[PDB]
Ligand SMILES: Cc1cc2nc3c(=O)[nH]c(=O)nc-3n(C[C@H](O)[C@H](O)[C@H](O)COP(=O)(O)O)c2cc1C
């Protein structure tokens with residue numbers, strides 16, 4: 227009947243939102259997402275200063291998904307903070323701000339500034355652990371001690387409930403270690419699974435060329451390629467983090483895909499590639515499709531089936 | 540125009556072979572692979588003792604690929620060694636034997652006894668590193684210290700050229716570290732990229748259930764899902780291991796997919812999921828399709844384009 231829900235001391239019309247980075251870079255983009263049927267919106271990951279990002283072409287899409295090496299192009303933290311503080315109409319839907327500083331100190335500096343705006347206006351923080359490659363060391367969520375430092379320092383600096391955007395893991399020991407790190411931090415109230423599947427490579431057969439310019443054609447994968455990976459991460463963290471929410475991201479094109487994310491454990495469902503390809507109309511279709519599948523199954527609420535994927539024996 | 544290759548002191552009619560685990564567990568399976576049009580075959584990864592593997596269902600396939608948690612079911616090393624020593628007809632095509640011991644000691648035990656048969660009959664060793672070690676630790680090739688130990692021990696015990704089967708990596712740091720480990724070992728003459736994309740989760744919407752029984756539905760992904768991941772890993776190791784061959788595996792359903800692998804750097808091209816689904820007739824189709832692309836482009840041999848993927852600017 228209706229898909230409205232309450233999470234994190236906020237009310238949402240439905241569980242759908244954009245994925246960080248998609249339709250959320252400029253004021254125009256944020257106003258468009260706010261005008262859409264989505265339940266929420268999140269801003270592009272920001273740095274302290276503005277960034278141009280990588281040379282073009284840096285995003286390409288195909289029937290099975292997309293590849294990107296954007297390079298963190300963004301208008302800078304001051305812009306996103308001003309949007310949260312002065313421009314966003316909170317009567318329309320909640321706002322999440324994504325932060326992706328290139329060091330712990332930069333993240334700390336941004337969160338200290340965000341915190342009073344969070345208290346006054348209710349903007350929510352999504353901390354992005356992914357970043358540009360630094361030769362000689364791994365991405366932060368793949369370096370468990372670095373992750374722990376980031377979360378400790380942000381937790382201290384911010385002091386309020388926040389969430390973390392995670393890259394996918396592929397190994398059950400890794401799920402156990404990552405989840406135990408996250409569970410050390412009671413202020414981490416949601417985990418968003420997943421960011422793009424890192425460093426894929428799309429090749430065009432006719433031209434015999436890679437399709438994006440940066441990184442010799444390597445970039446993160448989204449879309450249909452990554453749905454089972456996304457579900458696996460959603461469920462793994464849903465099981466391991468009983469005191470946290472899980473937000474699902476990856477491979478959502480349909481209400482059925484959203485239903486699968488919710489069965490795995492998702493509270494919110496984020497839409498990246500499909501949104502970039504279809505535009506913000508997609509949210510009315512996703513809502514219609516998810517309510518149709520609920521009606522055919524006899525489900526009246528999301529809670530009835532969230533996390534209730536069945537195992538064999 | 541021809542698909543012939545000469546590598547590792549063997550001659551191959553064409554680059555195609557099965558992926559380890561598909562159509563290669565029983566004598567019947569190996570005879571079928573031998574009778575097919577493939578250029579080579581590999582045996583199922585084996586252990587010292589025979590294994591039943593995990594409970595069924597343990598493999599499922601879908602339009603975009605497959606998921607599996609087989610659990611290393613196999614006839615045991617002695618069976619595969621006898622096939623290599625006494626049964627295979629080396630006049631038809633080369634044989635690779637895949638080994639996947641559950642400890643370094645188990646691998647050492649097997650390769651000591653494989654050595655004299657390798658030397659006399661020319662069977663080629665593929666050591667599977669995308670394999671469990673101690674439960675609660677990551678798979679061997681995700682634990683770089685363990686990987687080094689396995690390679691040191693196997694290189695000393697075997698004493699002949701061999702190759703390794705690698706899981707996919709997702710972080711540039713891991714490409715760099717993994718290739719540097721491999722480059723420590725001059726006896727590693729080929730690198731097969733990639734094994735399954737680990738611990739994905741497929742959920743069936745109608746039944747609200749996972750589709751395989753082991754591991755609460757989690758298992759390794761193959762097929763269309765994984766082609767850009769596979770291409771990335773082939774190219775990454777092709778660039779970082781200039782003194783080694785790279786074999787490509789992942790997401791091959793067509794001659795076009797094979798051509799992309801080869802542009803990325805692949806010598807041999809292995810076929811898993813699509814061979815499981817279509818059967819051994821796939822090899823004739825792949826050969827025809829690849830030859831047609833080569834004829835349209837004016838390429839007469841594989842070397843004309845191997846590793847010749849173009850980057851932008
Ligand atoms: C063009 C583009 C830019 C993105 N930028 C960011 C970002 O700034 N911050 C972030 O957390 N994830 C970013 N992502 C990742 C997406 O939020 C999402 O995790 C990923 O695309 C998987 O979802 P999908 O399968 O729906 O595309 C970006 C993705 C794309 C396609």
Ligand SMILES: Cc1cc2nc3c(=O)[nH]c(=O)nc-3n(C[C@H](O)[C@H](O)[C@H](O)COP(=O)(O)O)c2cc1C
Pocket residue numbers: 558559560561583584598605607609611637639667704733734735760761762763765788789790791809810811812813815
């Ligand atoms: C049913 C099944 C069993 C497999 N068993 C093994 C194995 O014993 N050893 C191994 O190296 N890889 C094994 N794999 C991985 C495949 O060799 C291959 O790396 C993976 O399926 C990706 O290739 P694809 O996209 O063509 O399926 C198995 C895959 C499947 C589907």
Ligand SMILES: N#CCc1ccc(CCc2c(C(=O)O)[nH]c(=O)[nH]c2=O)cc1
Pocket residue numbers: 247271280294295296297298299326354356357358359421422440446
């Ligand atoms: N290009 C490139 C490498 C890179 C990878 C990740 C990031 C963080 C921002 C980001 C981006 C991006 O701006 O490239 N793309 C994603 O798919 N996920 C993200 O989290 C920045 C830069």
Ligand SMILES: N#CCc1ccc(CCc2c(C(=O)O)[nH]c(=O)[nH]c2=O)cc1
Pocket residue numbers: 560584593607608609610611612639667669670671734735753759
């Ligand atoms: N089930 C389960 C966990 C597991 C994962 C990998 C292996 C090694 C053998 C193997 C298997 C398998 O036998 O499950 N499947 C793959 O896709 N690749 C492999 O290399 C053994 C066991």
